[PDB]
């Protein structure tokens, strides 16, 4: 039953001029099963696309499965110029208001986004928030598995990686990474984090790390995943790969000049360096080597400005300086920051008073004679 070369146009003309749409669907589904393992049969694909998506349920998703496989096969059959008018045509079909057919449409998008040059042409015309709309709550059990595979497919190109940074999709996937239900989307989202981090040629790898890998529950969640004993060696290797990179960048985010860059420029954001024990132990005399009033410049920012969130970082950093340097308590008494921390302990903010309570109690922990 092999050796089929001719009669392709005869099946094409019979497919268009057939009033029995159910028999035309059987003609289309038999053509889909035949082309599932065969070669190319896109001017006819430009003709078959207009008759498709026309008031039929089963014929819509099957032609979409056929035309994307026609797009996923053939070097000369690459019709990305015509697929640009076809991807936006199926983009209204890619809306999240349908039922029981978007999963095959996402699988059709999985074959469509498998291309390289068509993907960069897609993402400009995509509006990828619709894929983030699928990442929004619409019960994505297997739909997010198709969606995270689409994000892993778009994370190949580094030029597409830079355009993908104009969203919070890295932290929007960390919430989906915190799901961990079907034990396969956890495998897909872990390598997609490895794809976004490793395959990006820029200094923005830390910009993709401070967003979701550092300042979210990602490095902590990957600690328990390494404690897990899943049989997949690819996910087991990607777990160690993401832990080594993010563990290096968190250590690289605490070098006492980045803390100085946070101090001198200001705004005192809660970073991992302020909570790291290695940052406070190594940079103990870094405040004293920097003309010690620079440590009082942290105190001048704490005393003068109110800052109900930013002074909370100022309280914990001042106590870590006193904990790693008992002679700095005399320097804090020289600057008078102890009375400033005592008055800031009576602030109306809960986290500011809790941080000042741990700092002021650490300020009198050593108790030299007055």
């Amino acid at each position: 039953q092999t050796e089929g070369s001719q009669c392709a146009k005869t099946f094409i003309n019979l497919m268009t001029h057939i009033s029995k749409e159910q028999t035309v669907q059987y003609i289309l589904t038999l053509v889909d099963d035949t082309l599932q393992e065969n070669h190319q049969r896109n001017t006819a694909w430009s003709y078959f696309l207009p008759m498709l998506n026309r008031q039929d349920l089963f014929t819509v998703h099957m032609a979409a499965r056929i035309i994307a496989k026609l797009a996923a096969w053939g070097k000369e059959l690459m019709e990305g110029s015509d697929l640009n008018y076809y991807f936006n045509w199926i983009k209204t079909q890619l809306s999240s208001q349908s039922s029981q057919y978007v999963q095959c449409v996402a699988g059709c998008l999985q074959l469509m986004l498998r291309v390289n040059e068509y993907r960069f042409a897609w993402v400009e015309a995509d509006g990828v928030n619709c894929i983030m709309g699928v990442l929004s709550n619409k019960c994505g059990f297997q739909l997010q598995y198709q969606m995270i595979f689409s994000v892993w497919l778009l994370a190949f190109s580094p030029q597409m990686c830079e355009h993908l940074r104009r969203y919070n999709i890295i932290p929007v996937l960390s919430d989906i990474l915190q799901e961990s239900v079907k034990e396969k989307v956890t495998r897909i989202i872990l390598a997609a984090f490895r794809n976004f981090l490793e395959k990006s040629v820029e200094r923005e790898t830390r910009q993709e790390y401070a967003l979701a890998m550092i300042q979210c529950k990602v490095l902590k969640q990957l600690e328990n995943l390494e404690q897990q004993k899943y049989d997949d060696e690819d996910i087991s290797e990607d777990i160690k790969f993401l832990l080594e990179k993010l563990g290096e960048s968190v250590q690289d985010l605490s070098s006492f000049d980045e803390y100085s860059s946070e101090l001198k420029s200001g705004r005192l954001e809660w970073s991992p360096v302020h909570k790291s024990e290695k940052f406070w132990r190594e940079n103990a005399a870094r405040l004293n080597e920097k003309n010690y009033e620079l440590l009082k410049i942290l105190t001048k920012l704490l005393e003068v400005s109110d800052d109900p969130q930013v002074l909370a970082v100022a309280a914990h950093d001042v106590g870590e300086y006193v904990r790693h340097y008992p002679r700095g308590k005399r320097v804090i008494e020289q600057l008078g920051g102890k009375q400033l921390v005592m008055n800031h302990m009576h602030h109306e903010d809960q986290q500011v008073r809790y941080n000042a309570l741990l700092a002021v109690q650490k300020l009198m922990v050593h108790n030299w004679e007055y």
Binding site: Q178, S180, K182
Partner: protein, 91 residues
């Protein structure tokens, strides 16, 4: 009049089935892999995580009495926390 009749699971329903099965109380789970040590029972790392929270709870129930604080009871059989909620508990 009992039967050792087999029952299949799928490991996406391994918690929420068994927990509601353990919310009934008619089941007699029988170990049929006796040729194994007390470790490597597929979940030794996570039962110590419950045991670490057990060690923290047996410690925090001691210090709550030395300061002599009255204890709320509100006695009712609660909902069993999912492994999704488990990582949020250790925080």
């Amino acid at each position: 009049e009992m039967t050792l009749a087999q029952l299949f699971l799928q490991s996406e329903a391994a918690y929420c089935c068994v927990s509601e099965l353990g919310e009934l109380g008619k089941v007699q789970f029988r170990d049929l892999n006796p040729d194994v040590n007390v470790f490597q029972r597929k979940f030794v790392n996570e039962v110590r995580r419950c045991e670490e929270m057990d060690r923290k709870l047996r410690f925090v129930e001691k210090e709550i009495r030395k300061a002599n604080i009255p204890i709320m009871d509100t006695g009712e059989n609660p909902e069993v926390p999912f492994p999704r909620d488990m990582i949020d508990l250790e925080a």
